[PDB]
Symmetry: D2
């Protein structure tokens, strides 16, 4: 089965809810051992994986310190990293604060780079292959509004996905990204609660629905598998048609 992840061991950040939860569940169903990284205990995610017969555990980590994972990989045996943890801050750009800039950059971009660096340093030292899946955004391609640090960060994530593939593809680490469309999770709750903005989003989705977190799992399994061994530096949009429209 070229889509099996048996024998792999994944770290999924932001794994307690939303996309990270669905990805952790999907990787475990595909056969990976999954460590569910989160800043609070991923009780529900672990319950779901346990009920499904999968193999998972927790890691508590807080990327407000963007170097928080510096020692997480040494002798730990990870060979899939899903960089899903992320935050957003919404304000008019003319009054956007330094705090809302820095805190978003720290989690979404800086912590993504240094966590990936520590993961790859271990693989490269051990002479092993592995996979990185970054969670990008439609705001890696378009600008959106009122989220300057988020759009800048998510564009940056696409940039790092390309550069790190350029440097590491020949060393056996595939680095790719998924760009989800508009998915119903805590990240988008404020948009969904705004009737006008919600309608404007919905009518720009050719599939005619908001995504569900489970819609992102299949691409994460794929990009972590041998069926994607020649995929490097790609940004795959899983968006109901948004970028086509």
């Amino acid at each position: 089965n070229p889509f099996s992840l048996e024998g792999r061991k994944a770290l999924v950040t932001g794994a307690n809810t939303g996309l990270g939860q669905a990805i952790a569940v999907g990787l475990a169903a595909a056969g990976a051992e999954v460590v569910c990284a989160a800043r609070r205990a991923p009780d529900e995610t672990l319950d779901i994986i346990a009920k499904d017969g999968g193999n998972a555990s927790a890691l508590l980590i807080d990327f407000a310190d963007p170097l928080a994972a510096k020692d997480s990989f040494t002798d730990a045996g990870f060979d899939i990293l899903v960089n899903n943890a992320g935050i957003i801050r919404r304000a008019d750009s003319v009054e956007f604060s330094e705090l809302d800039w820095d805190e978003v950059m720290d989690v979404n971009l800086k912590a993504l780079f240094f966590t990936t660096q520590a993961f790859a340093k271990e693989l490269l030292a051990k002479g092993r292959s592995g996979k990185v899946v970054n969670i990008a955004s439609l705001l890696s391609f378009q600008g959106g509004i009122r989220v300057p640090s988020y759009t800048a960060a998510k564009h940056g994530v696409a940039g790092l996905t390309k550069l790190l593939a350029n440097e590491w593809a020949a060393k056996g680490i595939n680095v790719n990204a998924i760009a989800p469309g508009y998915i119903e999770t805590n990240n988008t709750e404020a948009l969904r609660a705004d009737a006008a903005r919600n309608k404007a989003i919905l009518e720009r989705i050719p599939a005619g629905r908001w995504g569900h977190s489970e819609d992102i799992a299949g691409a994460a399994v794929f990009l972590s598998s041998a069926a994607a061994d020649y995929v490097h530096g790609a940004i795959l949009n899983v968006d109901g048609g948004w970028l086509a429209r």
Copy 2:
């Protein structure tokens, strides 16, 4: 509950006698789809591979020199996966490029791709059935290349149709996506691999440091044809060793 399984599905793969089409047909059959191998000549080698793997496949002889050749191929036929892989390329200095080398490439790579997809979707839409289309694009859907103006124009056109048709049919349950292969080993690329200077220049621009294999394209075609990709619509997935990143 295997989201990559194609059990119960029925695929038509064009250009299925060789190269990427052969590998895609073999991969779809191994994932559980019944596969009809569309080709100009009997795709016996492809059918033999599938039969040895225990899969279910048959041939359809079709020649896209008539770009409307598939107009009646889908009525009551049960297809719900279409892979538009047949394609050709013609090389000459653009200042001298002939009308024939323009027209013949457009006919197979772009016009036939549209009209074959139209007939496939007509049948699904008429019956309320879901389905999947996977178009084979190229790096030359994104970059220009040289000396192949009808091929670059056609492969850019394929990316455009992938987006428009997704835009029009996503809500009707027809996923339309594309794979853009990079440099993959097939019989048609042996001449590039045999030219030492050209091969070196190609490899220097591939981060992975190797040509792809046809099975790498087959894996992506199974993914985009499966429930694992149900919310993927209008996407162009590059399977390229890093080429476009570099």
Copy 3:
């Protein structure tokens, strides 16, 4: 030493009787180029505008229903700027889209654009002369739209040719670039502006909050035809009010 001046240059603008082609012809002439206004019918309104501004222009009658119609238009004619603006669009559900609506759009928008550019460049390359090509692309070189499959495929194809021809001819001093207009006020877009719901939906997706003017496209065509853009090759410049950013 005005890098935007086109004094001494000679341009052919297709579709020059109306809309964007008319504005581009007027803008190039105001920048100092001699302009030949190519059109199916006498471009008298365009010529009158240019004559009142004190510019130098004349007509060429040409019909791209024959996509090779310009094959002999450039020999010894002195053109060193070409703007490929002529284009049409046909709308129908993609599942019903006709071969005629496919072919006629491809012929004008893509095949004629290639062969007209080929003839223009043949003359420059044969003589060692520098020159400029500006292709008129579309938002539908980037996104899909709906119900216009031959137009989206053709305009994606135009972006591809812009890249390939730049790739092949940049070192010979022929700059090949494109402008992708967004939603611009011309006679051909009056029906969209007249449909209140369609117009509202368009405006909601334009950050600038307005339709563009044909003169906005003319300004970009003068820039890309000038020494101010000498290192710009293979670019597709969107002039779109913010559409693609949004």
Copy 4:
């Protein structure tokens, strides 16, 4: 003349050398008053503009403090901003330091956002129109190698160009970017000195030459002018054909 900048007043950052110098010279030749912002006196740039008969002056500012321009716009009358100041740090990504991350992000991305914010806050308060031209990069589109903070930053600059156009286009501030190709300046000196890397770059440029700083000036005049009033959120590559190839 739709390309004239008479009556406009521009701030050009990084104006002492390289692309910023050429842009400042080009804007002044088009008729703008140009303030040449730099961390050291832009003696040569001012001499060139003076010889050409243009109107220019200096502003000393150091974006190692990314908020350094917070008070630069109040009652100053700027209505063109060219965000050109930028740095690069080259190292293998597996050993890339936090310092080389943060310092590049500070100048190339964070300072770009907050300088633009202060410029726009003044325009919007005064009810005036204006123009922003950001200097992006080929590494806003591709990954490159060994420059993770630079690629992430320059992707981020493209993202901000789109988002700020989305928010401000209707308020009369055009925000666009130029993505130069490989141009001979101090930024690329280390590449040009490496014979192998230099050759690999050159042979990927269809025009057959490295750019010169003067090749970037015309696009900056254009994007600052009335001839570009409907151009918003665009990233114009001025690259000798690189992205086509």
